[PDB]
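Hello,

Following up on my earlier ticket. Below are the three sequence lines again, exactly as submitted.
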Amino acid sequence: GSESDSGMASQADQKEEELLLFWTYIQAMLTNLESLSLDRIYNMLRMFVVTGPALAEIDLQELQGYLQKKVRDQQLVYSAGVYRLPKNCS
Amino acid sequence: GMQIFVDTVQWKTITLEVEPSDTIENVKAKIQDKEGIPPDQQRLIFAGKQLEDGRTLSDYNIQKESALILLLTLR
Amino acid sequence: GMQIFVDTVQWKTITLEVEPSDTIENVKAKIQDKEGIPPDQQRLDFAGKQLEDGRTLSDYNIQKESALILLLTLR
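Thanks for your patience. The regenerated structure is below:
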């Protein structure tokens, strides 16, 4: 029962909500499936980006830069060339 | 001697059939029935949209060989 | 009607005890007895290295409470 949680920007709404959807995949994915290559979640985001008008399809720098941000926010843990969520803070 | 934790992961795709005139509740119920997939515990997103029970397959335009993602309990 | 694909995640951590003197085929037969986990259908991984069943636990220097992730049939 959630509807009004989108805001009003007349442009940036869709974008935030598309990226938040992508994060709804990768967050809930790594919550249990806590071990996957960038290429796996890349293939998934790109599937759900091409199926709709989501950003008119993203790019490497966007998706890689998304992971990069998460790591630099400490909201992603980079293992040995493989991504997983910090299910522990410390 | 010493113990080990063996983490069994099942990351895999399943295949089923469905009709356009069926509701979404039937899809989540039939994967629950067959595979033991708990619908609310494992939240579904189809083609980049979250599924409302009250809607039909045709409502979202479920074409053939279409892919659904199953995300386990997040929040 | 139309046939669709549902992409399932099911992760679970098991706990057993093993000996340093035992072979990996012991651990194999344990998971294969417990949940019917077939080694040929789902090979075990340890820090990015496959456990060959002909090897020994001490051969890998296995620690107590060591975590190993079983990946789907991939060599």
